[PDB]
């Protein structure tokens, strides 16, 4: 009966048809670039294939790292770009990325000398020219009681880059600079642009265009400098000092990219991460049919996504990124933090645009009164099924009994039941009925601890491969081995600046 | 038939027949009312919207908007179509169908490719209507500024465009006397982008004009410049920034000439595909704005005023939110219906439509567009972010009366008792709508809710028959009239698209 | 029993007592200026008498024209002021208004040269004056809730009034005419808004500034200041102490307040005043306003004046003047399209006893509650809605309107129904029947959304009414008047019979394109810019 609802968990057959599991799931090949989202037991995983996007609504300290980030870091066989704010994911899985999958590891730490460098001017064709320049200016000066001037500063950056362009990629400009009057580089950086032929005739007309420098140079220059100020920092200047990896090969070479950043601790790094992700996403709108070399997939483990702030590039790109095998999995504390106003959010409709492009959503549960509303909604989303309710009557004189059966409604999962799942989680796929499963714990499964023990001598002496490690001492020995860099990526290839 | 708990019910067959969505013999329906397929009740048993009202399809991702709505009407619609094809699959799959089935000329506008087509907004002027055209394009190129650094510049740049167009009509018409002064006549965008430096760079207040050319150029042709000399560098900068996208060879080739007369969009049997991804290339925004402006406004004449414009044209606005800010549709959907310009908008959610005007249409613009959709299709997906959307939909379907049975046993003996009662039940609960799968809900403004199946094209031989009889690679493997094998039809169709044998006439496009 | 509710539909009794219907309703005389709002059958109408105001909450494409506007356009025997943004209502009922009611038809299309003109300065007695001038100034220069810098708008309004006093003391004085003739001052007779705005640059001779012509370097002898009145001179001194020191920002906002009048169409529409709005309740006239403020914000303020002067020119009791016995039904069709018109918010509560009877037609209560830019604000929307005593509600099956109908469902209330349950011994076959009482919505939300061509009428002093739309195209009560007017409709369709429903609307559009159902356009003045 369905009078009081028809809610139900998804069947094993439909999950097989959706390719989430296989008939012999414990012996599955993992040959469809699948992302592990849950487990039915040790080595019996639920994994998402295809190109659809994953959302993980994980409260603070709910186990997103040990149940999603670390398992896929250890298992996923294609390219990975992971957000690593605590500098622990890469420190734990880099040796696996390099030894098991044979992938070069690039670490982008803008607030440290030891980092790989990214320069956006390495992605322009100095010699659709000015399109990249205008997009870069839009990134440098964001669109927003004080209009104009900022647009004049964007024009200042426009003909700034145009001036440096004319200064090098011209045959006479080479001699003009060979007069030894300026010290411009061979390839420009953002700091250098900030410190600074009929198209150049129009550029001179722009040098006398709206008169932005006539009795109004002070304010325009002040806004320009307030925008270019992040590059007065030595760490940021070193981060933009060069470009070590070409993002146009993110789907060609076998690479793993970690980003160690924190814009909440310092609002300065915001625009640099914005530029970084914009160039990374916009360097791969080439279909594998048009470029047969771009065959690999790039899983983007956007851990601590809401900590990144407003990245409008994602809002504009999520709806078209899927077919290019740029597959992000967003992990945010809660939806409420996502919809917030631009400064620390994406707006209501922008967050809705991002969330509409997620086809698999994992829901962890914690018993916190601050997450009630959310979980309540989740309860209502799972719907109700029909249940039998038994009542009894007894004649107090004779003692005979009467049993009555009626139908009632029951939530598939009540709010407090959702809040007290512990290590269980709910999976909602767009085309499937709700699923309940266990977190793919990495430290509990030999499926991942074997890979962790393989590449480390200490764990190899302590624990045997294939056996579940002694839970009372495994994590501590893993930490002790991480202190000596046994699990970390080889840090000798990470460049160091002055 | 009890309405004690509401009277919610699906629309009856009789009322659907009266609404021309189906016929008394729907399997043998002739499709003679220019109907748009919006779902099926079975193999070849389709529900089809007649009339002139507009369709809206709220189809999320991984929902089958193309395979359930775009592809079937592409195979089936007998009149003219204008499809938005950003992924290059719809046209590359149905072009040979539009060509061979309905004898229609396929015209593909892919600005970012050599094999493209050409659109010149200048071929739409009365070479009393030339001044009207000048004012029209001046309004279409200079929009109203609610908050600018100054509205005076906006109005003055509109007036500068108008006066420059008047002077250009003056010089290009005794137009041959000045031709013999120096060493094309059909204007293009970035050659009009040079219409601010000079004849080639003469001064913007001298040259051979105003001197004393108030009478050399017919009254107002050189008179407005005498009055607008107060009420050049920044003006040239703004004009060059406006015309700069034309400097790209792609857009340059797009606006180099014109191979189609949009005033004949309802005359000749044609099919217009548009390949564009403004989310990737953000520069095509204003360009597509002018494109659709001239495509729609050049068709705003009633068929009673010109019966030669007899054909209808369905605008399959697939990925409508992708187009960006197309204020044409915001200002036009309220009057287009009576002109046989019939759009069907396809979008992922209401929120994506309500996005801010730069990347969406705004709340008020989204409401203005949604208010002109009389038939609304609802595909279901099990996504928490859509709960509020489907719950309301559930509430819109209503409640009906159902029977509730309670049994009671006398344990000492075993004799039983059955008791029935009436209870309320939502016609469809929110979580039931969320898990419809291949089903969908149609809401027509003047009808009761309709539930049906998605009109899939690979499922039904109603469409695979055409796709097979058209391409030679599929005719050998599969036969007509029979539903082909589901395990190998899609891959064979992919492979047929690889060879282009199921595409269209690529040789024609410039 | 009323334990679970007592909601019910109004009986034929109370409707008769409310004068909404009569005993011989089919043969009703229509002698109490009634507005048709519904029907219980072909030619069996529900019609509102009295002076109360009507509201029609009709979603888009829900039949407000065919069910309300066009029926009363055909039937209403008194004066009609209709809003016709699509120019279709007039095009369909003009010759009915003219031939059946002998009413002169005026057309106000501020974007077609074929239009009648309106000039607010024609409603001012120059040679009382201060009150009307200040009212017109507050109309052109309205208050702002921003309050961050209202002094500039105040001084711009002071400049407007001052310019008006200067014009009055120059063109309606005795020595001012001699002064203008001696110094060759370009100044027209009856003033227009365009000229009052152009006076910001200065007095036309070229043109020199006001600060120069009066008390400046151009007025060396000081004679040009003496020609003005002492009150105007004191106001000019006060303004020179106000804006004239440290004016540059006042002239900008002043010239911006007259920017719509740099347009040629608005210039022609303002140049004259064809119809006297003080005659709206004496002569038999029918006025059609063809504008669209959403298509162009320029006509926004113009309409604001146009309607305002129309209302306040008709605030006279019939005991003051016995010529004002004619009522004026104001078919405010597509009301929110007119944007924010303060005159309606301020005047809905006072224009009822003047026989200015508006019927507001809007798509939803939420769109009317929109903020001043595109609506009236919550408080203003409530103010307008509080003065509507008969509200018609159309239904459509559209989720965007669900919250509107749920509430309406709740407004209709619940009633008590009987519910039967059955039991049965599964062995002996003996059964049991039980009856209880339950509650039932008079109309569930989905029932209202699927009402089709039925509607709900809520009158302030009655119980809910459910009736059928007063469709004109299927009722000989209206098609008789529409076929009596067109020769070919008379050649095809017979009077007193329901026309062929498959072809009547199409043949009607055909006859309309030939202008047979339209007003005589020969009497509409035509201008030209030169």
Author numbering:
A (entry chain B): 181 to 307, 335 to 351, 355 to 406, 444 to 745
B (entry chain C): 180 to 306, 334 to 379, 382 to 391, 395 to 411, 422 to 431, 437 to 457, 464 to 742
C (entry chain D): 181 to 307, 335 to 412, 421 to 461, 464 to 747
What do the authors report?
The transport of the CagA effector into gastric epithelial cells by the Cag Type IV secretion system (Cag T4SS) of Helicobacter pylori (H. pylori) is critical for pathogenesis. CagA is recruited to Cag T4SS by the Cagβ ATPase. CagZ, a unique protein in H. pylori, regulates Cagβ-mediated CagA transport, but the underlying mechanisms remain unclear. Our structural and biochemical data together show that Cagβ functions as a dynamic hexameric assembly.
We crystallized the soluble region of Cagβ (residues 166–748; referred to as Cagβ1) and collected an X-ray diffraction dataset to 2.8 Å resolution. Molecular replacement using this model found all six protomers in the asymmetric unit of the crystal, which together form a pseudo-6-fold symmetric hexameric assembly. The protomer of Cagβ shows a 3-layered overall architecture similar to TrwB. Residues 631–658, an extended segment between two α-helices in the NBD, form two long anti-parallel β-strands that stray away from the NBD and constitute the bottom layer of the 3-layered Cagβ. These extended β-strands from the six subunits together form a 12-stranded β-barrel, contributing to the hexameric assembly. As in other hexameric ATPases, the NBD makes a major contribution to the inter-subunit interface for the formation of the hexamer, resulting in the placement of the ATP-binding site at the inter-subunit interface. The six subunits in the Cagβ hexamer are not related by a perfect 6-fold symmetry. The asymmetry in the Cagβ hexamer structure may reflect its intrinsic dynamic nature and ability to carry out sequential translocation of CagA through the channel at the middle of the hexamer. The central channel in the Cagβ hexamer runs continuously from the cytosol end to the membrane-proximal end, spanning a distance of ~100 Å. Strong density is present near the Walker A and B motifs in the structure, which was assigned to a sulfate group from the crystallization buffer, mimicking the binding of ATP to the nucleotide-binding site. Our structure of the Cagβ hexamer shows that no arginine residue from the neighboring subunit is present near the ATP-binding site of the NBD, suggesting R241 in the Walker A motif may fulfill the role of the arginine finger in cis.
